[PDB]
Amino acid sequence: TEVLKRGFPGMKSVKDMPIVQDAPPPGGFPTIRIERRLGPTGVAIFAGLAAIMGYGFYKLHEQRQEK
Amino acid sequence: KPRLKPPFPAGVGLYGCPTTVTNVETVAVSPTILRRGPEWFSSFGRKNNAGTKLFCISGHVNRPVTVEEEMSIPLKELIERHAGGVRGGWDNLLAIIPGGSSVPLLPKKICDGVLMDFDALKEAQSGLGTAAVIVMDKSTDVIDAIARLSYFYKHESCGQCTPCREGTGWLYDIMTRMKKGDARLEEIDMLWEITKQIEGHTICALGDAAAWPVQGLIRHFRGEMEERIKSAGGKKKLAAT
Numbered sequence A: 001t002e003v004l005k006r007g008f009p010g011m012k013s014v015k016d017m018p019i020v021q022d023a024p025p026p027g028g029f030p031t032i033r034i035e036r037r038l039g040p041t042g043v044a045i046f047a048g049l050a051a052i053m054g055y056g057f058y059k060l061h062e063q064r065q066e067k
Numbered sequence B: 001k002p003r004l005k006p007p008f009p010a011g012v013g014l015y016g017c018p019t020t021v022t023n024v025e026t027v028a029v030s031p032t033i034l035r036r037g038p039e040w041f042s043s044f045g046r047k048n049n050a051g052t053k054l055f056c057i058s059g060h061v062n063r064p065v066t067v068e069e070e071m072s073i074p075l076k077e078l079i080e081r082h083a084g085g086v087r088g089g090w091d092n093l094l095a096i097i098p099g100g101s102s103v104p105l106l107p108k109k110i111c112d113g114v115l116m117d118f119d120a121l122k123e124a125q126s127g128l129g130t131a132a133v134i135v136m137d138k139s140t141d142v143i144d145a146i147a148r149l150s151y152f153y154k155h156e157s158c159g160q161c162t163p164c165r166e167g168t169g170w171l172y173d174i175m176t177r178m179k180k181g182d183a184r185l186e187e188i189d190m191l192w193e194i195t196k197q198i199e200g201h202t203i204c205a206l207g208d209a210a211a212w213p214v215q216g217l218i219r220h221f222r223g224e225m226e227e228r229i230k231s232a233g234g235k236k237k238l239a240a241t
């Protein structure tokens, strides 16, 4: 019965029946990432903030004298 | 259509009365045995194999013949004398059925030496049967011959019981496919299994007589069947590609 389904003309043995299924490619699939993959120093952040605030305070002093 | 035993014909037979069925040749030799004595009759052949026997030699034989002979005679003696030997010489022999059609065949190696006897063909995996000798030579397709025997047993089934009635046609279909080589290699083992399913499982002995020639063909010529399957793909697989 299975010979009626998968067998081909001139098949000599039942062990010669083809199998074509969903299969990985030869060599398999390539590897993948599994695990988790990953700022500025606080001195640098505080220095930039101090520079901006110092410029602001200088401008405040200048506009106060003009007023 | 045969009855099941028990009852037995000597207990309940024809018209419900005690009855014995005997062969013509069994009946006919009895007056000569009674007149000439039992010691004269038992002086021929081996022990438990006494007396004389009519032999019919047919097939590929130079002088086919119905001839009377002593029992326990060799096949080669019985064929070379009284029948002129095998057509083309003894080396042209392929196979011989020694006991009609219901017994398995024998190849050339067993035949050279075996005695035509009840207790000698049985040990050679055959039987004396009716002592009807059928000779085939090397020009014979032995699968075709046993296929025609399978056709005979399909045609002669009375159809009463399930294994004989359904399986003789199945054996004939499988053998017809095997003759052309349109089969698989494991279908030979399937064929042996189907003969073992028929044999010993029926009402009468025609089922056994239908299984036995195929068993002998498989046993002594499985290589021929395998070669017939393999070489058929030299004319069937050229169209598949």
Ligand code: SF4
Binding pocket: B001, B002, B156, B157, B158, B159, B160, B161, B162, B164, B165, B202, B203, B204, B205, B206, B207
């Ligand atoms: S074995 Fe065949 S012939 Fe004998 S009783 Fe069964 S069917 Fe009929």
